[PDB]
């Protein structure tokens, strides 16, 4: 047997109130906040890559080799 | 046997109130907020890539190799 | 046997109120909010890619290799 | 047997209130906040990569070798 | 047997209130805050990489060798 | 006097505002005002006797959540002679 | 006098504002005002006797959450002769 | 007098503001005002006797959370003759 | 007199402000005002007798959290003759 | 007189401000004002007798957390004849 990333909960009682709960989070992006007030942005681009926004990426993969979650704002000229 | 990313909950009682719950989150993007107030943006682009918006990407894959979740704002000229 | 991303819940009682629930989230984009107030945007584009909007992408795939969830604002000139 | 990243909780009682809970977090990005007020940004780009935004990437992978979670703002010209 | 990164909790009682909880955090980025007020930024880029934003990357991998979590603001010209 | 001008351009925006007053705004926010959450009570053998004569009595397992804007929130009020003139 | 000008450009923005007053804003925030969370009570054999004559009594397991803006929040108030003139 | 100008440019921004007053803002923040969290009580054999005559009594397991803006928050108030003139 | 100018540039920003007043702002912050957290009480055999005549009594396990802005926060107040003239 | 200028550049920023007043700001900070944390009480056999006549009594296990801005925070106040003229 093999357990990986397993949340387990068990409870037992006779009389009363019993609560059992389990939660799991894998590759989760939570709570991203961004505020821009009275911001001046001047961009001149000639053949390049410019990123000024908000990017939130969450990736979960099984048996995946060589995977890329995020690739933001790049110039690639491989030969 | 093999368990991966498994949420398990068990409860037992005789008299009363019993609550059992299980939750699972894999590759989940939650709670993204963005505010732009009185913002000035001037962009001049000639053959490039400019990104100024909001991007939220969530990807879950099984047996997937070489997968890319997000690729934002790039210039690719591979030969 | 093999379990992956499985939410399990079990409950037992004799007299009273019993609640059993299970939830699963895979590749889910939840809660994206964006506000733009009194925002000035001037864009001049000549043969390029400009992105200023809101993008929310959720992808779930099984046995998929080389899959791309989102590709936003790019210039591709592969030979 | 083998346990890795496992959260386990067990409780037992006869009369009263009993609460059992388990939580797991793997590759989770939580609580990112950014504020820009009265900020001036002037960017001139010629064939390069400029990144000025907010990037939040969370990646969880199993049996994945050579994986890259985030690659932001780079110029690649491999031969 | 082998245990690695395992949180375990057990409780027993007869009468009263009993609470049992377990939490696990692996590769988690939590609580990142950034404020820029009245900031002036002037950038001139010619074929390089400039990064001025906020980057938060969290990666959890199992059986993954040679993995890179974050690679921000680099110029690569390998032959 | 508030003046905004833009002349001899390709793309031009000119905005002029005399007086401006912003308002309250919520974006992806959660609020909880007067909320009762997660109350558990277990009783086996309770003997309760109440003898009330012209009064307010609150007895037993009580869970009250109140949210008032322009009024008063009370649970038990045994008063008398409440008058408002003009 | 507030003047903003922009002449002989390709992209130009000119904004002029006399008086400005910002407001309150929430972005991805959580608030809890008057919140009761996680109350557990266990009682086996409780004997309770109440004799109330013209008063306010609060008895037993009580969980009260109150949020008031322009009023008073009370649990037990045994008063008399409340008057507001004009 | 507030003047902002920008002439003979390619990209130009000119903003002029006479008076400005910022406001309160929350970004990814949590607030707790008047919050009761995690109260556990165990009682086996409690004998309680209350004899109230024209008063306010609060008895037993009580959990009260109050948040008031322009009012008073009280638990037990046994007063009399409350008057507001004009 | 406040003047800001920018001439003969490629990218130019000119901002002029007469009077400015910043506000309060929270970024990724937590606040706790009037919070009761983690109260545990165990009682086996408690005998309690209360005889109240025109007063305020608070008895037993009590957990009170209060947050007031423009008012008074009291637990037990046995007063009389409260008047506000004009 | 406040003047800021920038001439004959490639990238130029000119800002002029007459009067400026900064505000309070929190970044990744935690605050605790009037907080009760971690109170444990164990009682086996307690005998309590209270005889109150026109007064305020607080009895037993009490946990009070108060946060007031423009008011008074009291636990037990047995007063009389409170008047505010004009
Ligand atoms: C809660 C409670 C219980 C028993 C004894 C008392 C004194 C209180 N407290 C209050 O009534 C506080 N109050 N007073 C007034 C003014 C007023 C009160 C009574 C009669 C005439 C005028 C009021 C007016 C408009 C909207 C709200 C309110 C408010 O909330
Ligand atoms: C809570 C309580 C219980 C028993 C005894 C007392 C004194 C109090 N405290 C208060 O009533 C505080 N108060 N007073 C006034 C003014 C007022 C009160 C009574 C009658 C006429 C005017 C008031 C007016 C408008 C909105 C709120 C309020 C408020 O909240
Ligand atoms: C809590 C309590 C219990 C019993 C005895 C007392 C004195 C107090 N304390 C207060 O009532 C404090 N107070 N007073 C006033 C003024 C006022 C009070 C009574 C009658 C007429 C005017 C008030 C007005 C408007 C909104 C709030 C308030 C407030 O909060
Ligand atoms: C808490 C308490 C219990 C019993 C005895 C006392 C003296 C106190 N203390 C206070 O009432 C303090 N106070 N006073 C006043 C002024 C005022 C009070 C009573 C009647 C008329 C005016 C007040 C006005 C507006 C908002 C708050 C308040 C406040 O908070
Ligand atoms: C706590 C307490 C208990 C019993 C006896 C006393 C003296 C105190 N102390 C105070 O009331 C302190 N105080 N006083 C005043 C002024 C004032 C008080 C009563 C009546 C009329 C005016 C006040 C006004 C507005 C907001 C707060 C306050 C405040 O807090």
**Secondary-structure class of chain A:** mainly beta
Q: In which range does the helix fraction of chain A lie?
A: under 10%
Radius of gyration of CA atoms of chain A, rounded to a whole number: 23 Å
Largest interface: F-G, 86 and 86 residues
Give the ligands present: ligand A1BGB
Distance between the termini of chain A: 47 Å
Q: What is the 3D form of chain A?
A: elongated
Give the strand content of chain A: over 45%
Written as H for each helix and E for each strand, in order along the chain, the element string of chain A is: EEEEEEEEE
* Biggest beta-sheet profile of chain A: none
Q: Count the helices of chain A. How many?
A: 0
Oligomer: homodecamer
Number of β-strand runs of chain A: 9
PDB class: structural protein
Keywords: Complex structure of alpha-synuclein type I with small molecule CNS11G incubated for 6 hours., structural protein
Assembly: decameric
Entry title: Complex fibril structure of MSA alpha-synuclein with CNS-11g at 6 hours
Any overview of this molecule?
10 copies of one chain form a homodecamer. Chain A contains no helices and 9 strands. With 79 residues, the first copy, chain A, is mainly beta. The A-I interface holds A 40, 42, 44 and I 10-11, 13, 15. β6 of chain F pairs parallel with β6 (62-68) of chain G. The complex binds the ligand Cc1cccc(C)c1NC(=O)Cn1nc(Cc2ccccc2)c2ccccc2c1=O (5 copies). One copy of the ligand Cc1cccc(C)c1NC(=O)Cn1nc(Cc2ccccc2)c2ccccc2c1=O sits between chains F (70-72, 74, 77, 79, 82, 84) and G (71-72, 74, 77, 79, 82, 84).
List the topology elements.
Ten copies of one chain form a homodecamer.
Chain A lengths: L2 E2 L2 E6 L2 E8 L2 E2 L2 E9 L2 E7 L2 E3 L2 E9 L5 E9 L3
The complex binds ligand A1BGB (5 copies).
One ligand A1BGB sits at the interface of chains G and H.
